[PDB]
């Protein structure tokens, strides 16, 4: 029987039949090939397993044997799993730049990556310059932006201006990018986003031995611990260079630092598999952190 598979990227969907023993890799390979993506190291296929967990699809394993929720079209999302350290020197393909711009922006819009008011407006203008090209008195008439979801929700909730005010504001910033290309614009966007405190960092809800709530941030540059109340500022940091060994044993995870004088960090995950992922993420992420410091 043919296994029906849908793989949406951020601007495209793809639907084909799959073989009852097609390897995750073979699947990933088809998708990237069809899209014409070369920078394949940042990306993954994400599906949802039977327990409800969003999971990354493993390439060295039969795509049919990883327990993805069994619906008619087997559904996956093709998203960046890892983020570069510097967008401009790490994203060479227009395709890659595009799939990033989109994924990043979406999160910026969903209050996922925090972004303060002025920068939000600044970003929006780059997003509209990307969409619409040069501003034009004759074309873009008062309200030409009424249909576009342009600003982080919290931005709108906190600084109360009118809808047509925020628009005037972006319009002003839009008017100024006159001459930018759709491509450049998306890049100028990313260059600003990649500096946001929450950009390219995966959070996990944890608690220490004392049983108090915390967040663990795994990212391009290492681990970071946050207080539940603040997702932005790290309480303690651990770059890769300053970490010797990370391990877990059941729900208990432990970080061991390079200098012996430091009291190694210990936290408690809500389930075993949560650590499994934390371990997986760090490994893949550190690996790339090395790989871009060799030839």
């Amino acid at each position: 029987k043919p296994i029906n598979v849908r793989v949406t990227t951020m601007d495209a969907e793809l639907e084909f039949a799959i073989q009852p023993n097609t390897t995750g890799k073979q699947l990933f390979d088809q998708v990237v090939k069809t899209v014409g993506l070369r920078e394949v190291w940042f990306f993954g296929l994400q599906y949802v397993d039977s327990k409800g967990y969003s999971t990354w699809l493993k390439l060295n394993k039969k795509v049919t044997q990883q327990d993805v929720k069994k619906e008619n079209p087997l559904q996956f999302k093709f998203r960046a799993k890892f983020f570069p350290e510097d967008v401009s020197e790490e994203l060479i393909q227009e395709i890659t730049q595009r799939l990033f711009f989109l994924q990043v922006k979406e999160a910026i819009l969903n209050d996922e990556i925090y972004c303060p008011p002025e920068t939000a407006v600044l970003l929006a203008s780059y997003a509209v310059q990307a969409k619409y090209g040069d501003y034009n008195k004759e074309i873009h008439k008062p309200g030409y932006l009424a249909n576009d979801r342009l600003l982080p929700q919290r931005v709108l909730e906190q600084h109360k201006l009118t809808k047509e005010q925020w628009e005037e504001r972006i319009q002003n910033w839009h008017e100024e990018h006159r001459g930018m290309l759709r491509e450049d614009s998306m890049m100028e966007y990313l260059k600003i986003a990649q500096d946001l405190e929450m950009y390219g960092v995966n959070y996990f809800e944890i608690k220490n031995k004392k049983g108090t709530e915390l967040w663990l941030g795994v990212d391009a540059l290492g681990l970071n611990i946050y207080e539940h109340d603040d997702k932005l500022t790290p309480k303690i940091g651990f770059p890769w260079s300053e970490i010797r060994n990370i391990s877990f044993n059941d729900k208990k995870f432990v970080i061991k630092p390079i200098d012996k004088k430091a009291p190694d960090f210990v936290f408690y995950a809500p389930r075993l598999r949560i650590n499994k992922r934390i371990l997986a993420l760090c490994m893949g992420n550190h690996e790339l952190y090395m790989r871009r410091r060799k030839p």
Partner: peptide, 7 residues
């Protein structure tokens, strides 16, 4: 139970 060594 698992372990990884970084730096």
């Amino acid at each position: 139970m698992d372990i990884t060594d970084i730096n």
